[PDB]
Ligand binder design. Sequence first.
Ligand SMILES: CCS(=O)(=O)n1cc2c3ccc(cc31)OCCCCCCOc1cc(ccc1N1CCOCC1)Nc1ncc(Cl)c-2n1
Length: 289
Amino acid sequence: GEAPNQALLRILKETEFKKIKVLGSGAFGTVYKGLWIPEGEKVKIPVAIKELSPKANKEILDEAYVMASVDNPHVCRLLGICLTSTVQLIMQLMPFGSLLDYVREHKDNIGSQYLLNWCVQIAKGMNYLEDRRLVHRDLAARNVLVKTPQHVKITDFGLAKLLGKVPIKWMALESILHRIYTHQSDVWSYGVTVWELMTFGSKPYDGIPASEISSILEKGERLPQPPICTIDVYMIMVKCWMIDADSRPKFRELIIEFSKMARDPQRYLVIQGDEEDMDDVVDADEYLI
Ligand SMILES: CCS(=O)(=O)n1cc2c3ccc(cc31)OCCCCCCOc1cc(ccc1N1CCOCC1)Nc1ncc(Cl)c-2n1
């Protein structure tokens, strides 16, 4: 029971945008890179169009509701939806793809400053979501997209729910065992995501069946310390992975700590060699109504 959600849901004409290329596909559906041109407004906006039964429409509209209810520089911006045969979701295009893929591809040219700034931005997005009493439930490096190497945004709100099949290796223990989800379980997943970033995109618990992850965590086992990580960063992750959810750090505290770290990045991360016509193109972050 909260304030009325006065967010605007925008309906976009299908004739207004052109699909350009396929970005990805799978059981969830397919996502296209494309361009959106509102009629007579003299702007072209690079967009991602998510697409794929009446059960699919229900969940896609739940995602549209969630994403239309949020507005943060570190959260995916939903431009609107196009009511075709299957409902399409129009989102801001993130040219550089997922943070996981970007990090795996560019690990040889990624420094401490970028990693700590990404941690700061992700924490800011999650803190904003907490302010909106929103629980993401699927936070991971694969669900963080790169608008620019200096700017990342949280996406994939398919599992997002209000405060009141799952990827086991990113979940808190209480979520694995009692299906309890809280902003602190999101903090656990944030720790796992930071681990993904610091190991340059390695698979957490590589080769371990998901069925024994619960026992592994119950025994006290945790993800190892990444080589580039000083005890400060790894301690932050371990705090995010504590059993008592109230003992885990809050997202605002993570913002503070990682900002402190980013002011002197080399003290906290040790990385070898650290030191056609688009005239009218407008990014969605600069197209407001
Ligand atoms: C994150 C789950 S998602 O369902 O919410 N989702 C959101 C997407 C998106 C794209 C493809 C996709 C799922 C997507 O298919 C399965 C995922 C496989 C590829 C992951 C990232 O791929 C890219 C994305 C984007 C640009 C390039 C890639 N890559 C680059 C090269 O390597 C292959 C493709 N720019 C984007 N901009 C807004 C949204 Cl909103 C999106 N992507």
